[PDB]
């Protein structure tokens, strides 16, 4: 209701204010220690993600069943796009946390993780070359939440169209021509296909490595959702 009535700038500002904080890791090593830091970090990020999702316009209008479904489907995608976003200004490096900056060689510590790291780094470099803006990023992340699990179905689609309008608004405001607007919009959304791909592959390893390190109860239930 209210989400459908928001203006383009109101959409942007609402998503900007809803942005979760950048958390630190416990970092002060091995494969157990590497996975331990990542999982501990991800688990704390999941808590903020849940409360962030509730602040995404139109999300609370959905049933608790659908809200659960959407987050179960998109949680790793959301974590990953957050990771590549803050890793933008650090070429060849992944900024999991301000005190946890890892290069691809440190991804060889865990079996099969270097392949995912490379895909994430390539995504980050792609964001860098496109000069992805913060206002665009928050639109992409909200799209991922609402799309990756989709009168309820039509409501989700109406909100999605609004975010599309918001993206186009940002590009028009940036001075881009009409042809440039469509092209950049297409470019951004096709990256979500790669983000989906990385999440599917990452998930495939996570419910394999799930027994290496202590996985939290919430994390396990999110993992179980993809099985």
């Amino acid at each position: 209701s209210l989400a459908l009535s928001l203006t383009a700038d109101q959409m942007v500002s609402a998503l900007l204010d809803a942005e979760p904080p950048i958390l630190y890791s416990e970092y002060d090593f091995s494969e157990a220690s590497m996975m331990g830091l990542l999982t501990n970090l991800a688990d704390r990020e999941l808590v903020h993600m849940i409360n962030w999702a509730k602040r995404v316009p139109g999300f609370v209008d959905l049933t608790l069943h659908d809200q659960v479904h959407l987050l179960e489907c998109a949680w790793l995608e959301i974590l990953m796009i957050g990771l590549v976003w803050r890793s933008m200004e650090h070429p060849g490096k992944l900024l999991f946390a301000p005190n946890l900056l890892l290069d691809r060689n440190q991804g060889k510590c865990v079996e099969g993780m270097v392949e995912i790291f490379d895909m994430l780094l390539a995504t980050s470099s792609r964001f860098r070359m496109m000069n992805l803006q913060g206002e665009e990023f928050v639109c992409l992340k909200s799209i991922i939440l609402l799309n990756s699990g989709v009168e309820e179905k039509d409501h989700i689609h109406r909100v999605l169209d609004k975010i599309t309008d918001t993206l186009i608004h940002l590009m028009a405001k940036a001075g881009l021509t009409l042809q440039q607007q469509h092209q950049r919009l297409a470019q951004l959304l096709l990256i979500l296909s790669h983000i989906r791909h990385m999440s599917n592959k990452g998930m495939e390893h996570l419910y394999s490595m799930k027994n290496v390190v202590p996985l939290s109860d919430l994390l396990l239930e999110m993992l179980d959702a993809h099985r």
Partner: peptide, 9 residues
């Protein structure tokens, strides 16, 4: 499930 009650706030 945990996710359920975390959303229910």
């Amino acid at each position: 499930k945990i996710l359920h009650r975390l959303l229910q706030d």
